[PDB]
Structures are given as C-alpha cells and as structure tokens.
Design a binder for this molecule. Structure first.
Ligand code: SF4
Lengths: 45, 197, 112, 61, 113, 207, 181, 157
C-alpha cells in the first residue's frame, strides 16, 4: 500500500478520546533516596 | 551603528553564502552546514571553508557596511564567462535603512527572509560548473570613488590604508522580477528583490 | 585569416623581435634580467627605512597602490588636478577577481 | 672520537644516541638509581636499572 | 474548528515562511494530540508544500518516512499521522520556549514551589 | 646563500659558512630565527613578513611561551672530559638554575640583555647591507567558561605529556601498570624538550 | 511527553530520564566561548521542554566540559539558560539532579551504579598480547570489573592525583543490583 | 578637447603596452610590472623598459592623434610568423576631466579582465602591426559621455 492509504486508515480512525487536558495523568513517583541521606562518595574538593 | 553593524554583516554573509551555494558557483563539498563563523548565525546555513573566499567576502561586506551611509541598493550578479552577460540578478534594497533591541526578533526576521530566499532558489533549474561565475554591483546616492589618490595618500595607520584600498577598489559602470519578503523590524528596514533571464 | 577591412593602411615594423630584444636591452646599459629587489608588501611598514646605511643610500619601495607612481607619457607624469564632481545615482563594480572553481576543487581533493 | 667526527653541543650519551641512532634514552639522577638498586621489593626498579645499563653499554657499540 | 486552524497554517506557511508542526497547532488552539492530527489530515485534504509523515511501529519503534514508496513492516504499523508540513526541502526546524500553562496532557506529580 | 649544485636541482640548499651561528656560547633559538629570516628573505624578498615574524617572536619571548631549552647558557664545569653543561635561565630579574624554573613560583624572563645582545647583532649585521634597521622594529614592542577551557587544555596537555613520558620509560620498565609513571617521574634529562614542557605544566598546575 | 505514542497508560511509567554523558561534543584544542554557549543554550531549550513533564538526571562524560579524570564533579550552576534559575534554587532537586560521573542511585530501594564509560574505554585503549571489540568482549570486561571489586583497573590513564586518603572510592564496598555503563 | 587629448594618449599607451605584454609578441622580464599604475586601478600594469620602443609607441600615438579627424578606426593586428595570418585583431575608435577619466578607467579595466582570461600562446611566433582605417566576437565597455564615443570589440580565429 501507499502512504496515502495508511494515512487514511490511521488518521480517519482516530479515537480523539482521553485527551481531557484538564485532569492529566500524574507521572509515577520515583525518588532517589541517595539525594540527601549522607556520604556522597565521589564528591571531592 | 552600535548593533545593526553586526546584524547587517551576518545577514549579508548568509546572503552571499546561500547565493554562492544554491547557484553551484562553487563545489558543495567545500561548504558545510554550520552555525558559528565568528558570529552567531540565526540558522544552519551552508558556509564555505576556504581561506581566500573567507576574507574576500569579509572585506566585501566591510566595504559595503562602510559605504552604507550613501548606498541604497546592493546587487549580486551572476554572469557567464564565455560571454560577459548578466544571467541572474539578486537585489537587496536599503531604502533609507532606517538610519540614525530584541535580537531574537531580528534573528527570526532574518531566518524568514533566508527561508524565502531558499524557497525561491529551489525552484530554479540546476546550474552547471565550469566558469558560471558571479560579480558584485552597488548603487549609491551621492559618492565618487577612485579619486582619493590625488595627493599620494601618505599613510600613517591601518585605517587610512583600508579607506584608500576600499575607495580605490571600485570602478564605475552603467526577464521576470520576483519580490521576496524583507525585514519589517524597526531599526532594520530591509527589502528584497530578484531578477531572472 | 581575419580580414583587416575595406580601407586600411600599415605602419612601420617594430625594430626588435623576440630574441634580439634582451640582447639589445643588455647592450643599451641595462641588466638582461631585473630581479626583484627587497620591497615592503605593507605601505605602513615602510617608515622611510631606506634612508642610508654606512653612507650608502638604498632605494627600497613598496608594491601597494598608494606608493606606486602613475604612468608617464614622454617623461611627464600625468595626473588629475581638479576636484572630482560627484554625480547622483551612480553605479560601481568590484574589481578584484574571485578564486577559480578548479582551484578550490584541487584544494579540496588534496585533503588538507 | 664522537667530538672529532661529529659537530654538536652537548657531547653526552643521550644526545649522541638521539642525533646518530635516532633513539631518545631517559636519564635518571644518581640518587634515584641508588634508591632503585637498594629496594628489597619492586623488582621493576631492578629490571629498569639493568636495562638502563645494558642499553648504555650497547649504544657504545 | 477547521477554519481558524487552516487560516493559521496557511499564514505560517506562506506569509511568515516557517515549518509548521502539530505542536504549534495544539498550543494555539488548546486541543489534544489526536484532534491536532485530525485537523492536520483535514488540511492535507482539499498544493505548494511538502508533507512529512511519521509511522509508529510495534516494539516502541519510531521512524521517519522519506521515500514514501517502500514502507517496511506495514502490518506492524500501529499509528501513522502527518507530523509537519514544510515548504522547503531541508526540514531544519527551530525550537523556542513554550509556555504550556494549560496545553499539557501529562502533568508531573510535583509542583514548582 | 642558496646552492644549486646542478641545473636539474630544483630545491635549493641552505649553505652557510662562517654564519653568525658559529659561536662557542650561543642559544639554539637564535640559529633557527636567523635561518627562518634568511629563508623568508630569499624566497619572497618580503620585509613585512620578516618584520611580523620577528615581532611575534619578540612578543612570545616577552610573554614567556618559550620552551626554555633554546634559552639556556651551557656553562662547562670540569669533571679534561668536561661533560657538565650547567644551564643558566635568563637571569634572576643572577645565573638561575633550571630547578628555579621547575619551582616556578615566579618568572624572571626579561626582555633584556639576553634578547637584545643575542638577536639584534646578527640581524643588524645582515640587514645593514640591505638598508634596514631591526632595533626600531623591537622598540615599538615596548570569564568562567574561558577559565574552564584553559584549565581543560592545560590538563589535556599534562595528561598527554605524562602518557608520552610513561611510554618512553617503557623501554626500561617494560611495564604499563602502576609505578611506571613513578619511575618516569624522575627523568631529569636536560637534552629532551618534553621534560621542560612537563615541568612547566606541573608548575602551572601547582599555582 | 506522550504525544507520539499516545499510550498514556504506558508512557506515564517512565518516572525520570538519566543522561549518562556526552551531551556536548567538541575538540578542546580549538574552541571558543561562543560555540559552547550556543550548544548549552540548544540543550537548555530541550531541557525547558522536558523538565515540567518528566524528571531528569544529568551526568558528565569524557567529552563534556568538565574534568577529564573519572570522578568528575557536576558541571556548574552556570552554563545554562537564565530561565532555568527556578530549578537551581536548591529546593527543586527531585526534578533535576546534577550528579558526579559515578553514582549509586537508590531508585525506590534499587541500587544501580552508573559510570560515564571512561574506564572500559581506557581498558580497551590498550592491546594485550594474550586472552585470545565485540559486544561479548565488553560484557566480559564489565563482568571482570564487577568481580575484581575495582571500578578503575588502570590507575594512571583513568584516575587523577589525590583521589582519597586511606580509603579509595573506586574499590567496591557494596555490590549493586544493576551496573550501567 | 583639452583633457581628452592627453587622456586618450595615456589610455592608448597603456592599452598597447598591455596588448604587447599579455601576449607573446614580446618576451617577459622586459617590462616594469611592479612600478607604475595606469588609472589608480589595483591591477598591475606593465610598461616596457627599452627607451626605443617607448619612443616608437609615443611617436605613433602622436601621429595618430594628430590626424584623429580623418581616421575612424585604429586597430592593432597580430600577425603570425611563417604564415602571415592575422590571428588576433583588436580594434578601437569610432564634458568634465572626470567623466573621460572614469570612461578610460572602465575601458582599461574591461580590457585587463578580458586579457587575463586568454589562453597561453607559444613564444617567438606572433608579431604585431598597427593599422589605420568562424569569428568569436567580444564587446567591452567604452566612453559614452563624450561626443566622440569609442566602441571596443575584439575578434579571434
Ligand atoms: S621526557 Fe624524559 S621521559 Fe618523556 S621522553 Fe623525553 S626522556 Fe623519556
């Protein structure tokens, strides 16, 4: 098939849903505990 | 003259570089897409990497900027060598030059003008090598060159030598017009034109 | 070959040729080949240096346009005396020749 | 013999080896060589001084 | 709306010549990405520009179609929408600061203090 | 002058006899400078390029960007098998040792008697027969990102010098691991220019 | 940003991005302040577009404007656009964290060690005339480095002067879960 | 008619010197290419050193300009040795001191630019001859302000 066929098959079949833009999904919280604990090993003067 | 000098300089540099590249006057392998040529360029333009052409264009732009106080038009000609006939003419208007801020806006305007120029050049047919060369023509308001050597011009520094070598390097002389977009910013009121056939 | 035209005349032949020219120049009291004497490429670096040396006056000049003398016709240097007259709406052309396509091609092929 | 044959400045073993044999040999002080020769451990220093003297002897030939 | 979007697109294409992306349309109209792709396809329908389309295959693979004649793994294509419309041949976009005060579809868990 | 032993010979030969380089006590930099000026005068006959080169060399000597190997007086100490070339380095503004420059807390390279009486005599003798003076050419001679760039360049130079010295000492140690740089850190060969550059980089990094 | 894949259910699982090194590449022999500033401002844009959506972890490298030895300090508070001053206020550290070249990140209790790769690149810079540049060779070298409990096997080519006093940091003291090179 | 006389004299002298030097009618090293300037132009203009040839050129130029009324064309034919065939034929001829000055300057510049792009010719094979009145023609600039407008054309083969 040509690029036009794929475009007409994909863009025309767009759902256009879940894009509320007012209640977005929050990213998964990942915290590096080594940020402020102690003993930065490779931190030299 | 405080900051428009560098902006006009880099604009003329990108203009000459794009004209020389897109018209196949020099081999494209000698050109490279860059952004810094001793001055921050507003777009990834193809600039040559040859020493002689470098200071050639540098001195040309310096003379043009020094004479800008009386020049109102700058044209780059493209002529054949088998016959001294003008084939292409690219005009750059300087109507009053808005002579005596927001550098990002000036860079955006220059980028838009260069994009318009590239779009216009992309529609032209392929140009061959082997002596399809270029020239340079200017149009002043009221000036006379080639007569500053009537007193032997005893030199004392580099400024006087540069002034003499610039005033002595000019010689007097004597279709489908396609307009392009220029720079509508306050300080730099520049217009663009073009000629063919 | 190329015709001269309908009506034309002929002037006297030159006295010298390609071989006897240098021989006559040598016999006239001049060196056969005038090699390049020491000269300053920059007119600022002159500073009137060739004044003298151990009582020997030396003639050292430059190559720039500002120092070169105008050509003379019959031993009299001709020059413009009256002030120029600026005319409005003039045009000019750049004189120095740009490099050659073959030159930059050979420069790129050498892989510097 | 080197001074009578060649015409150089330093007239040392390293200078001659570099100007005739195109070989540059490092040079150590006498104190460093003594400290290397009296090291019970670090056989690298012993091998170093041995190769040093062997090269100084072979360059003479 | 399909009316103001086409006006803005043709303006930023012909008047102020610069490549246009669906991100600019989303920032100007405050719409979603799928709606922006639908508007871009509608503008491609009903020509003095060059279309740049991208296709997202399986296995989280993303590529840029250049030949537009030989699309490898056409069965594994999960999405294919026009990415940008450039009048020139050389793409070479430009990027600047964007204030996404309300045009963000995914917000971070932390807020700037 | 230039010698052409045959008409087929294309390149000239720099043949000198009794040149100013002939001297019992002399610096190698003077010989190279005189050779370069002679080559420039014979090839292009341009006095401006020679003046620019001389001014650049004078400015470099006044700044302190010299290798210090061609700016050392080699005194001959006995024990006649005199092979003790003690090196004087530019004075004290005397007769400082190279170890003083090694512990280069301060610099004493003076645009003074050394430069003058070792450069202007031969150039003056060579250019008076032409009709130009060289003393007047020398009389006229009288942020965070940049700091980081300079520091990085100095560190790369020091690392390259350490690497080349270590590979040079490999001839003796025949090893590449640890203690190789420790053995190479004692090479005090005054006949090698890499040593001067290495100690200069070390002194610059220590301050 | 979830604009291409459109699968927010799967893209939102990427908590933070980890730039390991080599963000700016130039030849320190011939560079000026303008090129580095342009490259840093080009990076700053990308950064300003990615920051308010996903966290970022910046790490230097061998061709980065920092020290050439292994334990590289973070770049600086400067060398970025002035619009990023809100992130360098010392309070918003979980959003952008500039760390040294080696680091043992405890991502939700998972200890992962990341290095710029100067150690392996310097080990491969030699030619050993034994042991009989493929993927298996680098994997075996990394496994040997992990087993030997020494991150830097080649001292003078990798390490710099005065790394530590009586307690080297490059010697492994606790094995991590993932070794990232 | 005051300035135009001497200016045409010096222009013809420079043109003849250039057409002799840039071709092989006379050998090189017999001219002064690093001393004189024609019309303040940055290019190098050669002038011969032999006084006999200079006086010959000046005498013929004075003889031409003395009777410039009856003559309408002054060409310089290039005769080839052993064939007596005109290989090249440069032709010339049919206010303020400044307009004629710039006219002569432009004509000399065009002549220099046209001569500098000519193929090399062998030595001791061509002879020149001044005349008073498959073709590749080339047109150069001329004087337009003066009522004695001078055209400039060149032929070959
Ligand atoms: S400097 Fe010392 S170590 Fe480095 S090469 Fe020359 S001699 Fe060998």
């Amino acid at each position: 098939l040509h690029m036009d066929a794929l475009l007409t098959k994909f863009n025309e079949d767009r759902s256009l849903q879940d894009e509320n833009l007012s209640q977005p999904r929050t990213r998964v919280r990942i915290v590096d505990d080594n940020l402020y604990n102690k003993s930065n090993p490779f931190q030299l003067c | 003259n405080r900051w428009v000098e560098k902006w006009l300089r880099v604009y003329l540099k990108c203009y000459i570089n794009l004209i020389l590249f897109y018209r196949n006057v020099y081999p494209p392998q000698s050109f490279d897409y860059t952004t810094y040529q001793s001055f921050n360029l507003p777009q990834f333009v193809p600039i040559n990497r040859h020493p002689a052409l470098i200071d050639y264009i540098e001195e040309l732009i310096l003379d043009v900027l020094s004479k800008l106080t009386h020049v109102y038009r700058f044209s780059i000609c493209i002529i054949n060598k088998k016959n001294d006939l003008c084939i292409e003419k690219y005009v750059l208007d300087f109507s009053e030059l808005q002579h005596v801020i927001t550098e990002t806006e000036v860079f955006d305007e220059f980028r838009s003008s260069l994009n318009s120029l590239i779009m216009h050049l992309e529609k032209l047919p392929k140009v061959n090598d082997d002596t399809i060369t270029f020239e340079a023509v200017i149009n002043a308001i009221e000036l006379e060159l080639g007569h500053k050597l009537d007193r032997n011009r005893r030199v004392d520094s580099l400024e006087e030598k540069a002034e003499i070598e610039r005033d002595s390097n000019w010689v007097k002389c004597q279709i489908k017009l396609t307009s392009l977009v220029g720079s509508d910013v306050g300080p730099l009121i520049i217009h663009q034109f073009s000629e063919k056939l | 070959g190329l015709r001269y035209g309908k009506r034309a005349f002929v002037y006297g032949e030159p006295p010298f040729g390609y071989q006897d020219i240098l021989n006559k120049l040598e016999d006239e009291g001049f060196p056969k080949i005038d090699y390049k004497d020491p000269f300053f490429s920059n007119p600022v670096d002159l500073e009137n240096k060739p004044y003298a040396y151990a009582g020997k006056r030396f003639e050292i000049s430059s190559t720039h346009v500002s120092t070169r003398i105008p050509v003379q016709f019959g031993g009299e240097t001709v020059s413009v005396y009256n002030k120029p007259t600026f005319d409005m709406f003039s045009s000019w052309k750049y004189a120095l020749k740009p490099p050659t396509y073959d030159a930059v091609q050979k420069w790129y092929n050498k892989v510097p | 013999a080197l001074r009578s044959d060649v015409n150089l400045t330093q007239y040392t073993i390293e200078s001659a080896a570099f100007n005739i044999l195109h070989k540059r040999l490092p040079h150590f002080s006498f104190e460093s060589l003594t400290n290397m020769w009296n090291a019970k451990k670090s056989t690298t220093e012993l091998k170093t001084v041995l190769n040093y003297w062997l090269s100084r002897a072979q360059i003479n030939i | 709306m399909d009316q103001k979007a086409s006006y803005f697109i043709n303006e930023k294409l012909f008047t102020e010549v610069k490549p246009v992306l669906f991100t600019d349309l989303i920032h100007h109209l405050k719409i979603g990405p799928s709606m922006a792709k639908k508007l871009m396809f509608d503008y491609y329908k009903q020509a003095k520009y060059n279309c740049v389309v991208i296709c997202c295959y399986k296995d989280q693979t993303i590529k840029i179609i250049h030949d537009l004649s030989n699309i490898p793994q056409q069965d594994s294509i999960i999405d294919c929408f026009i990415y940008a419309f450039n009048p020139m041949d050389s793409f070479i976009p430009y990027y600047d600061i964007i204030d996404q005060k309300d045009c963000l579809t995914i917000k971070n868990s932390y807020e700037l203090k | 002058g230039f010698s052409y032993e045959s008409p087929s010979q294309t390149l000239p030969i720099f043949d000198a006899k009794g040149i100013e380089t002939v001297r019992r006590d002399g610096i190698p930099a003077q010989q190279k400078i005189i050779e370069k000026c002679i080559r420039l005068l014979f090839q292009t006959k341009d006095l401006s390029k020679i003046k620019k080169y001389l001014q650049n060399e004078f400015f470099k000597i006044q700044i302190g960007k010299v290798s210090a190997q061609d700016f050392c007086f080699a005194k001959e100490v006995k024990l006649y098998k005199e092979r003790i070339p003690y090196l004087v380095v530019k004075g004290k503004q005397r007769c400082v040792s190279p170890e003083e420059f090694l512990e280069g807390e301060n610099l004493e390279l003076d645009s003074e008697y050394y430069i003058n009486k070792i450069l202007i005599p031969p150039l003056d003798r060579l250019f008076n027969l032409i009709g130009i003076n060289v003393g007047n050419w020398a009389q006229e001679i009288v942020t965070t990102l940049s700091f980081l760039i300079k520091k990085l360049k100095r560190q790369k130079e020091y690392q390259t010098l350490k690497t080349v010295c270590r590979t040079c000492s490999y001839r003796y140690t025949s090893d590449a691991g640890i203690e190789n740089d420790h053995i190479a850190s004692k090479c005090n060969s005054y006949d090698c220019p890499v040593f001067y550059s290495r100690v200069k980089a070390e002194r610059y990094l220590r301050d | 940003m979830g604009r291409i894949n459109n699968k927010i259910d799967d893209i939102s699982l990427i908590g933070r991005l980890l730039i390991c090194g080599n963000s700016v590449d130039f030849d320190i022999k011939s560079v000026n302040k303008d090129e580095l500033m342009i490259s840093l401002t080009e990076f700053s844009k990308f950064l300003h577009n990615i920051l308010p959506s996903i966290s970022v972890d910046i790490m230097p490298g061998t061709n980065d404007p920092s020290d050439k030895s292994l334990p590289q300090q973070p770049f600086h508070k400067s060398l970025f656009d002035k619009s990023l001053e809100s992130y360098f206020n010392g309070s918003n550290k979980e959003i952008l964290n500039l760390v040294t070249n080696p680091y043992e990140f405890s991502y939700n209790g998972v200890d992962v060690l990341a290095v710029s790769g100067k150690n392996i690149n310097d080990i491969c810079k030699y030619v050993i005339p034994s042991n009989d540049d493929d993927i298996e060779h680098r994997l075996d070298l990394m496994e040997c480095t992990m087993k030997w409990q020494n991150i830097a096997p080649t001292a003078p080519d990798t390490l710099w002067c005065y790394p530590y006093t009586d307690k080297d940091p490059f010697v492994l003291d606790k094995w991590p879960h993932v070794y990232i090179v």
